[PDB]
């Protein structure tokens, strides 16, 4: 029961997600061509998220440690309908078998087509992620912990090992803009 709410570029919510998308771009293109920012409204994927959010709160001194983070994966189209699913994690990842996020849109943009075209439209997710007690760096969370924060330039990555601790709130259809 997923319904996509298309946001007007004149809407404060659109501009918020637009600036957050554009301002978090670093260099390893310069700016993005933001085409479509849609809200993801699924009552069951939401009640599943919030239920888990409260579980983590009670295990972390009444602090969910919630963050808005970007996500890229070949599974975006499936995620918005079936929710995040740790079962589809990669066994050999640097931080084990978890779902990867980043606070830089440009980081998540790397993982859109698995692990240089200006024409083909891309999609990222801008998600609510419950980090809870994040371990600074494997199969699951370490004991007493709910997420992994990594920092391998030195760009921050965040990994969860339970699909229900993230909700794909915004679907951003965009292109990387050609440097003039």
Author numbering: 952 to 979, 989 to 1075, 1088 to 1109, 1115 to 1129, 1134 to 1161
What is written in the article reporting this PDB entry?
Tankyrases are ADP-ribosylating enzymes that regulate many physiological processes in the cell and are considered promising drug targets for cancer and fibrotic diseases. The zinc-binding Cys-His-Cys-Cys-type motif is located within a loop region of 12 consecutive residues in the ART domain of TNKS1 and TNKS2 and does not structurally resemble known zinc-finger motifs; however, the fold can be classified as a short zinc-binding loop.
As alternative strategy, we crystallized the wild-type of the TNKS2 ART domain and attempted to remove the zinc from the crystals. While lower concentrations of H2O2 showed only partial loss of the zinc ion, incubation of the crystals with 25 mM H2O2 for 48 h showed complete loss of electron density corresponding to the zinc ion in the crystal structure. When compared to the structure of non-treated crystals, the structure of H2O2 treated crystals showed loss of electron density for the zinc ion and of several protein regions nearby. Although many of residues in this region are glycines, they form a helical structural element with a defined hydrogen bonding network in TNKSs when the zinc-binding motif is intact. Additionally, the residues Arg980-Ile988 also showed loss of electron density in chain A of the H2O2-treated sample. This region is located close to the zinc-binding motif and under native conditions is connected by hydrogen bonds to Ser1088 and Arg1087.
